[PDB]
């Protein structure tokens, strides 16, 4: 797994076309979402994570939680994202891990949003630019 974490004043998205023939189904209401004062977690789930969905999920929850605690963000947003890796996992595995990370951050006590899997999405973001506002993490099976 590769993750990029961006502490943002706001994050807004609007789903455009479908990228997979069969993407994640959504209410007209989940086509557009927005949060303020939000740690956005762009997650590329990789091939090597199929080995172990739960270790990798727990690791990611932890690593995202610490940074969230450290930057004083109560709001977290999980985003499926192809662009930190080139050896990516098949969608069931990615869907799986992303849902586990989402659920685990709700259980830690954050107000969590996520993005629908398998669309092209239009995005607006304002990135804070203090020292800890943009971080990369690599997470692997030990």
Swiss-Prot record:
It comes from the Archaea. Changing residue 120 to A: Isolated domain has nearly wild-type deacylation of mischarged L-seryl-tRNA(Thr), no longer binds L-Ser or L-Cys. No activity on threonyl-tRNA(Thr). Same results. It is found in: Cytoplasm. Residues 1-142 are annotated as: Editing domain. Belongs to the class-II aminoacyl-tRNA synthetase family. The N-terminal domain (about residues 1-143) is an archaea-specific tRNA-editing domain that has a highly similar structure to Dtd (D-aminoacyl-tRNA deacylase); the domain binds L-serine and L-cysteine and most D-amino acids but not L-threonine. Editing of incorrectly charged L-seryl-tRNA(Thr) by this domain is tRNA catalyzed. Homodimer. Catalyzes the attachment of threonine to tRNA(Thr) in a two-step reaction: L-threonine is first activated by ATP to form Thr-AMP and then transferred to the acceptor end of tRNA(Thr). Edits incorrectly charged L-seryl-tRNA(Thr) via its editing domain. Deacylates correctly charged glycyl-tRNA(Gly), but neither glycyl-tRNA(Gly)(2'-dA76) (the terminal 2'-OH of tRNA(Thr) adenine 76 has been replaced by hydrogen) nor the 2'-fluoro tRNA derivative do so, strongly suggesting the editing function is tRNA catalyzed. This is Threonine--tRNA ligase. The chain holds residues 1 to 142 of 625 of the full protein.
